Amino acid sequence: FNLDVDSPAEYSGPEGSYFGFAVDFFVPSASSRMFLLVGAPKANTTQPGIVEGGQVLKCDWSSTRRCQPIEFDATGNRDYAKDDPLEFKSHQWFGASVRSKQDKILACAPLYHWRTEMKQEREPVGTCFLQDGTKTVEYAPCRSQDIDADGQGFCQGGFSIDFTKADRVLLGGPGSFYWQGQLISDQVAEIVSKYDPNVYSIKYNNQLATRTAQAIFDDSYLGYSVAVGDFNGDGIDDFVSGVPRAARTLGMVYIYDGKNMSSLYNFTGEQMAAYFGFSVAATDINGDDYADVFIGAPLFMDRGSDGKLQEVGQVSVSLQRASGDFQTTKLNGFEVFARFGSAIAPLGDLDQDGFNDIAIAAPYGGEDKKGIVYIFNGRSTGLNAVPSQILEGQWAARSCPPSFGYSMKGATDIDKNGYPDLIVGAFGVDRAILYRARPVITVNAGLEVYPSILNQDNKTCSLPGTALKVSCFNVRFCLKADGKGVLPRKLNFQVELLLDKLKAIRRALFLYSRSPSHSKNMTISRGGLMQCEELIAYLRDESEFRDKLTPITIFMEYRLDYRTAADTTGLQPILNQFTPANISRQAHILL
Amino acid sequence: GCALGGTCEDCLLIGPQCAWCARCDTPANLLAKGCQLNFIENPVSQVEILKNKPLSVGRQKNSSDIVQIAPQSLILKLRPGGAQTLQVHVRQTEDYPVDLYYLMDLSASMDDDLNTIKELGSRLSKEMSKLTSNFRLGFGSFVEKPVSPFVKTTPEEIANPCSSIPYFCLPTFGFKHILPLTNDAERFNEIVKNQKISANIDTPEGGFDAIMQAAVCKEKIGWRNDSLHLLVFVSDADSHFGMDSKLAGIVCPNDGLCHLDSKNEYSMSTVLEYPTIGQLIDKLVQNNVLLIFAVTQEQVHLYENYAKLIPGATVGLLQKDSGNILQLIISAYEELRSEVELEVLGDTEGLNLSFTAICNNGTLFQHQKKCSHMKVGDTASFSVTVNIPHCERRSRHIIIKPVGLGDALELLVSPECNCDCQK
Ligand SMILES: *[C@@H]1O[C@H](CO)[C@@H](O[C@@H]2O[C@H](CO)[C@@H](O[C@@H]3O[C@H](CO[C@H]4O[C@H](CO)[C@@H](O)[C@H](O[C@H]5O[C@H](CO)[C@@H](O)[C@H](O)[C@@H]5O)[C@@H]4O)[C@@H](O)[C@H](O[C@H]4O[C@H](CO)[C@@H](O)[C@H](O)[C@@H]4O)[C@@H]3O)[C@H](O)[C@H]2NC(C)=O)[C@H](O)[C@H]1NC(C)=O
Ligand SMILES: *[C@@H]1O[C@H](CO)[C@@H](O[C@@H]2O[C@H](CO)[C@@H](O[C@@H]3O[C@H](CO[C@H]4O[C@H](CO)[C@@H](O)[C@H](O[C@H]5O[C@H](CO)[C@@H](O)[C@H](O)[C@@H]5O)[C@@H]4O)[C@@H](O)[C@H](O)[C@@H]3O)[C@H](O)[C@H]2NC(C)=O)[C@H](O)[C@H]1NC(C)=O
Ligand SMILES: *[C@@H]1O[C@H](CO)[C@@H](O[C@@H]2O[C@H](CO)[C@@H](O[C@@H]3O[C@H](CO[C@H]4O[C@H](CO[C@H]5O[C@H](CO)[C@@H](O)[C@H](O)[C@@H]5O)[C@@H](O)[C@H](O)[C@@H]4O)[C@@H](O)[C@H](O)[C@@H]3O)[C@H](O)[C@H]2NC(C)=O)[C@H](O)[C@H]1NC(C)=O
Ligand SMILES: *[C@@H]1O[C@H](CO)[C@@H](O[C@@H]2O[C@H](CO)[C@@H](O[C@@H]3O[C@H](CO[C@H]4O[C@H](CO)[C@@H](O)[C@H](O)[C@@H]4O)[C@@H](O)[C@H](O)[C@@H]3O)[C@H](O)[C@H]2NC(C)=O)[C@H](O)[C@H]1NC(C)=O
Ligand SMILES: *[C@@H]1O[C@H](CO)[C@@H](O[C@@H]2O[C@H](CO)[C@@H](O[C@@H]3O[C@H](CO)[C@@H](O)[C@H](O)[C@@H]3O)[C@H](O)[C@H]2NC(C)=O)[C@H](O)[C@H]1NC(C)=O
Ligand SMILES: *[C@@H]1O[C@H](CO)[C@@H](O[C@@H]2O[C@H](CO)[C@@H](O)[C@H](O)[C@H]2NC(C)=O)[C@H](O)[C@H]1NC(C)=O
Ligand SMILES: *[C@@H]1O[C@H](CO)[C@@H](O)[C@H](O)[C@H]1NC(C)=O
Ligand SMILES: C[As](C)(=O)[O-]
Ligand SMILES: [Ca+2]
Ligand SMILES: [Ca+2]
Ligand SMILES: [Ca+2]
Ligand SMILES: [Ca+2]
Ligand SMILES: [Ca+2]
Ligand SMILES: [Cl-]
Ligand SMILES: [Mg+2]
Ligand code: NI
């Protein structure tokens, strides 16, 4: 609920390059500045005789928003022999998947075709280019001696990639072994050390990969999507992958052990052709230090009040228990044909409340099908099913839908405000937008009315102007506020009070002003004890009203001065969601 | 609990059983108060029949004199919270026009099939002549999106996709509309002989692209306005759907529009994704097309589960040479002659509806809007209960029609929240 939509960072690219098909953060070690990584897989390159080779742009966040293309490979197609090309980098979709870890950047080209070293073929094995601080190598694990469809010829390795916490690469290729799919994992050390420009089929020793299976497992698309997290409690990140066409288009999600490639758990879809396994994610949503599995199925159809099926999409939330079981909870979409659940991106603790949050996008929803991203907050019980914020696209379609939210990435504090930020990609209109999170203010208001049982014949407090005394009482309100991250130590609030809020004749009003209302500016300090201001209010004369039954409700309301409490850039903080901005007490009459 | 709520307008909002005396109380308790009937204002839910033409049965020589649903037009005034049950009666006529579109897989494994279908058009129209006087048949073909990785992209394999066997095969194509449906069954036979097999594919094929185009392109296919729109899907393998084209770099969703070029060919088989089942349903229902899955045993269970989601869709076991396709179509036709299911169009995401099927005379099914095992001429009654949760802005148009039939019942659901004393 704390994402700034007023003034986000808008990045763009060359038209038709699909700028925003893949987005990620790039933060090198220590003092070095922050950067954004946008993949434009249909972009023209300076590579000799190669049309739409694709490129990944390193977008700058400081000052101007220029994005300089990263040079992974400037060379053209190498030759197996004279006038006999070995590879086809044209339309290879380089930058379709961009993953970053510390200094390391990993981009891939799923549609990279390759000629067999034996016969003249054109097989899409797919390739990747890992880049360290200084070094830059090529990683094509499917480009091996295992040829044709039955092998890893149509593997399209790099279709989905991800890093682990132990500096290990997880790569997925859907087309291996007659589209059974395959998960390949290599150490980043062997990718750079065993690299050889003269060798096209590199054999790795410490390689973890899924073996070929029976013919019944064909057409499964294993490696369509990937994610990492610990699930057998050994410290090592395990492999999670979506298998959308498994079990006769029912959809499955495999989990392999990230140590020896052994099957741990696997989920299964409930509906036909809902694409169960299109997108997977792993993040601890309930704050129990256990990785929780998120699985998307955007084509899932749901039954409405009218008793009519409607495609809205569904995301299944499987909470991991220490017992080993999962507490699966399904979450449906909101708009029809919006494909809710296409992209699932963990946000870390967006509001810094104590529980990690997550974002789920519906790329083809909203007015004019611009795109919608929903933000869901985590809690002790699990994932709060109701979204706390809705991010809307702001750009119309040219020929292909804007796809605002088709690919996104968060959980990275780029402005050092203490709150993780979010990048949303819209390749349909060649855009990438960085939303900044706002500081969260938790305020504990208090209101005391003593005594609450008003005696109408008490007449204690004297009333200025006349000799007639009136029955009176005290109204006492206190304000305390405190937040986390970077935020002002001085906060200005505007406190407003209303006596007898519900009732018409007003039966009670303050002493100094003789008015039911009272305005008071209040400058409270962060983390300090609640400063409190007390005021005297008196009850009206008996002859001025006959309503002795209705209780007199004392109402207080406060609002933060966002203008003066704003950041240097103009990033205004925000009050917490569930905490009410107004509380009320009441008083009675003995009658 | 009307005594705690009540404003005359707000008095009626707190409950459908509440009323205002021009204090908010039930109309029964208002009489005890002494409030007169003309003072008691109750915008009670009610129906107003506009067009209730009786069901016309028997062979009707005049096409514009056939009525298969009763009533036809209903203005429904509903109170927020209150409910109303509608009696809808549907019955199929004896002689009704029939459109058939033979959509066939042209994979190399369908070669032996082609040698048996060579004289189907004449044979099919012969038997269908017994059942209906107006029968028009069309033809279409599909294989797969001609893009990697679905098809090999080497210059020799692009020219001849069966070069490895070797065998003479035409290049892989997405979908080719060939014959607009017509009465001439002899023209059908000539075209089947002219057809050639394309690539041999053991992977799922791009059949779904053809279905979307065969349903949306009304003019170019030639669907008659008041007839059964039968679509016979003939394949021997599975079919790709939705985001399966992400592997090919196709990331733009199907728009559910017609894209047959001047050559009658699916021009957007390299631009748009495969249609999704959610999409196919929305278009097959809107275009009133009844889909028939004629697949082999290796695909029956799979396509059986597809047909459960698609209203009006059935399946059938096809032989390896497809020599029983005539026996499948007619039997599938007779079943549709026995099936009567209801549809609701243009309704609300927020409106709740319930259906009870009244098959025969003394059989009443709960939570069912479909009847079966009924001979042609038998009546089928349904009870449709409509309720509005809130108050809403204005009236909304809804349509209740049978599956496969052109006849429809229009519903004008207009809410009421204002009081007569406020005028
Ligand atoms: C998650 O979900 C996945 C999906 O189901 C599960 O992963 C699958 O698990 C099953 C169960 O273990 C696996 O089935 C096994 O497959 C192996 C395959 O071995 C292959 O290689 C052998 C040579 O190395 C070869 O001999 C095999 O061929 C045999 O079988 C074919 C016909 O099937 C026959 O023609 C041959 O002549 C051979 O006889 C094959 O190519 C297989 O060896 C296993 O056999 C088990 O069962 C037999 C029963 O008689 C028994 O005799 C064996 O000793 C052995 O116990 C078994 O069938 C499947 O391969 C997995 N799929 C993938 C993609 O990996 C996974 O289990 C789920 N996880 C969890 C936690 O549940
Ligand atoms: C690849 O590596 C993995 C992990 O490094 C290896 O997994 C180990 O498998 C061996 C057996 O093959 C296990 O050895 C056993 O451990 C038992 C532990 O207690 C079991 O019984 C408990 C009930 O009393 C039960 O609750 C518990 O469940 C736990 O493990 C399950 C998986 O095995 C998991 O699904 C549950 O959620 C829970 O985590 C145990 O089953 C012990 O009692 C036995 O006598 C035996 O020694 C190891 O413990 C596994 N290591 C783990 C789980 O970390 C795997 O074998 C490797 N593959 C190959 C081919 O070597
Ligand atoms: C409690 O605390 C609140 C703040 O939280 C205090 O509110 C502020 O009070 C000060 C006075 O002490 C205000 O400052 C004064 O504002 C006068 C407003 O004049 C007119 O301004 C508008 C036109 O100019 C504005 O708009 C144009 C664009 O149209 C801009 O270009 C300008 O820069 C201006 O923004 C008119 O539309 C408007 O109707 C006014 O007639 C100004 O004339 C004075 O000279 C002085 O600057 C301050 O504006 C208040 N701020 C807010 C947010 O309300 C409050 O006083 C405190 N109470 C107590 C008791 O201390
Ligand atoms: C990367 O550089 C590429 C340069 O090759 C860019 O490719 C361009 O892509 C567009 C389509 O998006 C092509 O437009 C086409 O135009 C033809 C008409 O061309 C006529 O002339 C040719 C001879 O040149 C002839 O063969 C044809 O038959 C036509 O008579 C249309 O028919 C097509 O439908 C399509 O609209 C451009 O032609 C093409 N450029 C070139 C130089 O060919 C690509 O866009 C660049 N990438 C990005 C992201 O910008
Ligand atoms: C009649 O009305 C007057 C006015 O509200 C009431 O006076 C109130 O009395 C209470 C109780 O003494 C005061 O609270 C405080 O109690 C602490 C206890 O130590 C004491 O230290 C404070 O000095 C103060 O006494 C309250 O402030 C006071 N209010 C005012 C405006 O003077 C009185 O109690 C009522 N009498 C009856 C019988 O209802
Ligand atoms: C007093 O605070 C309550 C919250 O405790 C306010 O209730 C809001 O009511 C609106 C009604 O449309 C809801 O949309 C909000 O979600 C409610 N707030 C919360 C935090 O849930 C109430 O409006 C406040 N009273 C006044 C006069 O502002
Ligand atoms: C078919 O009926 C529709 C009304 O639903 C009408 O718009 C269309 O013009 C009609 N076509 C013919 C050929 O009568
Ligand atoms: C209004 As009626 C008799 O068609 O249910
Ligand atoms: Ca682990
Ligand atoms: Ca957890
Ligand atoms: Ca949180
Ligand atoms: Ca931030
Ligand atoms: Ca055959
Ligand atoms: Cl090339
Ligand atoms: Mg086939
Ligand atoms: Ni009381």
DSSP state string for A299-357 = T-EEE-TTS-EEE--EEEEEEEPTTS-EEEEEEE-SSTTS-TTSEEEEEESSS-SSS-E
Q: What is the CATH number of the domain that holds A94?
A: 2.130.10.130
How distant, in Å, are the alpha carbons of A371, A485, A559 from that of A1? 18, 16, 17
- Residue B45's closest CA among B6, B75, B95, B82? B82
A524 HSE (CA, 13 A, CB side)? 29
What spacing in Å lies between the alpha carbon of B252 and ligand 10's midpoint? Answer: 35
Q: Are B150 and B10 in a shared domain?
A: no
CA B314 – CA B335 distance, rounded (Å): 9
Nearest ligand, CA A239:
9
What domain range is B391 assigned to?
A: 42-94+338-423
CA B338 – CA B378 distance, rounded (Å): 9
CA B176 – CA B267 distance, rounded (Å): 10
Q: Are B231 and B244 in a shared domain?
A: yes
Chain B interface, best mutation among A83, A115, A306, A398, by max B CB count within 10 A? A306
Q: Whose CA is nearest to atom 54 of ligand 3?
A: A561
Q: Are A20 and A100 in a shared domain?
A: yes
What spacing in Å lies between the alpha carbon of B226 and ligand 7's midpoint? Answer: 9
CA A86 – CA A498 distance, rounded (Å): 80
Q: Which of residues 433-472 of A touch B (CB under 8 A)?
A: none
- Per-position b or e across A99-111, b if 16+ CB within 10 A of its CB: bbbeebbbbbbbb
Q: Are A206 and A87 in a shared domain?
A: yes
Q: Which of B149, B276, B353 has its CB closest to that of A307?
A: B353
A91 touches chain B (CB under 8 A): yes
Q: Are B184 and B214 in a shared domain?
A: yes
CA A251 – CA A215 distance, rounded (Å): 17
Domain boundary among B269, B303, B337: B337
> What radius of gyration, in Å, describes the C-alpha atoms of chain B?
27
Whether residue A177 contacts residue A218, with contact meaning beta carbons closer than 8 Å, is answered with yes
Q: Are A404 and A498 in a shared domain?
A: no
B55 touches chain A (CB under 8 A): no
Mutate to test the pocket of ligand 4, among A15, A42, A51, A430 (most ligand atoms within 8 A of CB): A51
C-alpha B338 chain-centroid distance: 16
CA A208 – CA A185 distance, rounded (Å): 5
CA B172 – CA B144 distance, rounded (Å): 7
Task: Quote the DSSP letter at residue B9.
Answer: H
CA B84 – CA B71 distance, rounded (Å): 15
- Residue B289's closest CA among B209, B216, B372, B338? B216
Q: Are A224 and A330 in a shared domain?
A: yes
Looking at beta carbons, which residues of chain B come within 8 Å of A343?
A: none
Token output for A95: 């930058």
Q: Are B88 and B37 in a shared domain?
A: no
Domain boundary among A403, A418, A438: A438
Pairing of strands B73-78, B83-90: unpaired
Q: Are B296 and B418 in a shared domain?
A: no
Domain boundary among A406, A438, A470: A438
Q: Are A420 and A475 in a shared domain?
A: no
Q: What is the CATH number of the domain that holds A451?
A: 2.60.40.1460
Whether residue A495 contacts residue A562, with contact meaning beta carbons closer than 8 Å, is answered with no
Looking at beta carbons, which residues of chain A come within 8 Å of B370?
A: none
- Per-position b or e across B131-157, b if 16+ CB within 10 A of its CB: beebbbbbbbbbbbbbbbbbbbbbeeb
Q: Which of B153, B249, B354 has its CB closest to that of A122?
A: B153
Q: Are B212 and B280 in a shared domain?
A: yes
Q: Which residue has the tokens 């007639």?
A: A468
Token output for B300: 């029956």
- Per-position b or e across B211-245, b if 16+ CB within 10 A of its CB: bbbbbbbeeebbbeeebbbbbbbbbbbbbbbbbbb
Bridge partners of residue A583, in order along the sequence: A556
Domain boundary among A389, A418, A438: A438
Q: Which of residues 200-239 of B touch A (CB under 8 A)?
A: 202-204, 238
Q: What is the CATH number of the domain that holds B5?
A: 3.30.1680.10
- Per-position b or e across A482-518, b if 16+ CB within 10 A of its CB: ebbeebeeebbbebebbbbbebeebbbbbbeeeebeb
Whether residue A23 contacts residue A448, with contact meaning beta carbons closer than 8 Å, is answered with no
Q: Whose CA is nearest to atom 33 of ligand 1?
A: A214
Whether A262 is in the pocket of ligand 1, judged by its Cβ within 6 Å, is no
Nearest residue of chain B to residue A221 (CA atoms): B244
CA A298 – CA A344 distance, rounded (Å): 11
Q: Which residue has the tokens 């392999």?
A: A256
What spacing in Å lies between the alpha carbon of A190 and ligand 9's midpoint? Answer: 21
- Per-position b or e across A173-191, b if 16+ CB within 10 A of its CB: bbbbbbbbbbbbbbbbebb
Ligand 2: nearest atom to the Cα of A233: 54
Q: Are B123 and B265 in a shared domain?
A: yes
Q: Edge-to-edge, what's the strand order for the sheet holding A182-187? A: A160-163, A168-173, A182-187, A208-209
B164 touches chain A (CB under 8 A): no
Give just the sign of the alpha carbon dihedral B214, B215, B220, B221.
positive
What domain range is A474 assigned to?
A: 439-591
Asked if A311 lies within 8 A of B353 by C-beta distance, the reply is no
Nearest residue of chain B to residue A310 (CA atoms): B278
CA A107 – CA A562 distance, rounded (Å): 41
Asked if B148 lies within 8 A of A111 by C-beta distance, the reply is yes
Q: Are A469 and A338 in a shared domain?
A: no
Asked if B351 lies within 8 A of A305 by C-beta distance, the reply is yes
Return the axis-axis angle of helices B120-128 and B185-194, rounded to nearest 10°.
Answer: 150
Q: Are A465 and A329 in a shared domain?
A: no
Q: How far is A311 from chain B (nearest CA, A)?
A: 5
Q: Are A58 and A184 in a shared domain?
A: yes
Q: Are A456 and A515 in a shared domain?
A: yes
Bridge partners of residue A293, in order along the sequence: A282, A318
Domain boundary among B337, B359, B384: B337
What spacing in Å lies between the alpha carbon of B33 and ligand 6's midpoint? Answer: 38
Q: Are A424 and A522 in a shared domain?
A: no
Bridge partners of residue B41, in order along the sequence: B20
Q: Tell me the resolution in Å.
A: 2.9
Cβ atoms within 10 Å, residue A269: 24
- Way it was determined: X-ray
How distant, in Å, are the alpha carbons of B104, B115, B221 from that of B137? 13, 19, 10
CA B332 – CA B375 distance, rounded (Å): 14
- Burial of residue A168 (number of CB atoms within 10 Å: 0-12, 13-18, 19+): buried
To the question of whether residue B113 is assigned a binding role by annotation, the answer is yes
Whether A233 is in the pocket of ligand 6, judged by its Cβ within 6 Å, is no
Q: What is the CATH number of the domain that holds B399?
A: 2.60.40.1510
CA B270 – CA B175 distance, rounded (Å): 11
- Burial of residue B362 (number of CB atoms within 10 Å: 0-12, 13-18, 19+): exposed
Q: Which of residues 297-316 of B touch A (CB under 8 A)?
A: 301-302, 305-306, 309
Q: Are A407 and A458 in a shared domain?
A: no
What spacing in Å lies between the alpha carbon of A459 and ligand 16's midpoint? Answer: 19
Q: Edge-to-edge, what's the strand order for the sheet holding A407-412? A: A9-12, A431-435, A421-426, A407-412
Split into its structural domains, chain A has a count of 2
CA A268 – CA A330 distance, rounded (Å): 13
Nearest residue of chain B to residue A42 (CA atoms): B249
Q: Are B46 and B162 in a shared domain?
A: no
Whether residue A491 contacts residue A523, with contact meaning beta carbons closer than 8 Å, is answered with yes
Domain boundary among B302, B337, B372: B337
Split into its structural domains, chain B has a count of 3
Whether residue A68 contacts residue A57, with contact meaning beta carbons closer than 8 Å, is answered with yes
Token output for A511: 């002493």
Q: Which of residues 344-363 of B touch A (CB under 8 A)?
A: 344, 347-355
Q: Are A125 and A209 in a shared domain?
A: yes
Pairing of strands A453-454, A582-589: parallel
| Secondary structure of B182-229 in HEC code, one letter for each residue | ECCHHHHHHHHHHCCCCCCCCCCECHHHHHHHHHHCHHHHCCCCCCEE
Q: Are B212 and B361 in a shared domain?
A: no
Helix (H) or strand (E) segment spanning residue A60: strand A55-60
Q: Are B137 and B260 in a shared domain?
A: yes
A120 touches chain B (CB under 8 A): yes
**Coil, helix or strand for A424?**
strand
Whether residue A155 contacts residue A175, with contact meaning beta carbons closer than 8 Å, is answered with yes
Helix (H) or strand (E) segment spanning residue A67: strand A67-69
- Strands, E, within A427-516: which ranges? 431-435, 440-443, 446-450, 453-454, 472-479, 481-483, 490-499, 508-510
Q: Are B281 and B166 in a shared domain?
A: yes
- Cis before B149 (ω within 30): yes
